[PDB]
């Protein structure tokens, strides 16, 4: 069983719980406390391995420390809250400090995509994500969108950047 640990970052409000319940549960949940920070485990089969993902949903000792030895981030904004998009800027400064490096498995998640009238268009964030060097993916929590697809490539694009 091969280990990845995974951090979901971005701005309070744009899904972050709600994607990670639905990776770890598969179900949709409407209010999870918006204070709480803790990390889930997940055994999961991707091309073949067997994977342990350990993903701290973020919301700190135990932030800090997975900071610094996580191996791969999530950095999610919702596509109806253009602040959380332009915050993406300061979570992507944050990670490439703490990593001395442009070169860290990221993706750039735009999530809630079931709602209607974005206001961040998909050719915003993926210029945005162009710019960066990394993948953009489209979720919704509610309905599962994607959701599969943002966790399994950040686990590819861990293995692409170092053996695993
Ligand atoms: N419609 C829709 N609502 C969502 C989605 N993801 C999260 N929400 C809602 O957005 C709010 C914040 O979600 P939450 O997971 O707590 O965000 P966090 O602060 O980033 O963890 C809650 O009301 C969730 O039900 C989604 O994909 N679609
Ligand atoms: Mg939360």
Redesign the pocket.
């Known amino acids: 069983m091969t280990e990845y640990k995974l951090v979901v970052v971005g701005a309070?409000g744009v899904?972050?719980?709600?994607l990670?319940i639905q990776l770890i549960q598969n179900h949709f949940v409407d209010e999870?406390?918006?204070?709480?920070?803790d990390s889930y485990r997940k055994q999961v089969v991707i091309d073949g391995e067997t994977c342990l993902l350990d993903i701290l949903?973020?919301?700190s000792a135990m932030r800090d420390q997975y900071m610094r030895t996580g191996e791969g981030f999530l950095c999610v904004f919702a596509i109806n809250n253009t602040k959380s998009f332009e915050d993406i800027h300061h979570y992507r400064e944050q990670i490439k400090r703490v990593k001395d490096s442009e070169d860290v498995p990221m993706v750039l998640v735009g999530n809630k995509c079931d709602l209607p009238s974005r206001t961040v268009d998909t050719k915003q964030a993926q210029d945005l994500a162009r710019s960066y060097g990394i993948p953009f993916i489209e979720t919704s929590a509610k309905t599962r969108q994607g959701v599969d697809d943002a966790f399994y490539t950040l686990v590819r694009e861990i293995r692409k950047h170092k053996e695993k």
């Open positions: 309070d899904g972050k719980s709600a990670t999870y406390d918006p204070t709480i920070e949903d973020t919301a």
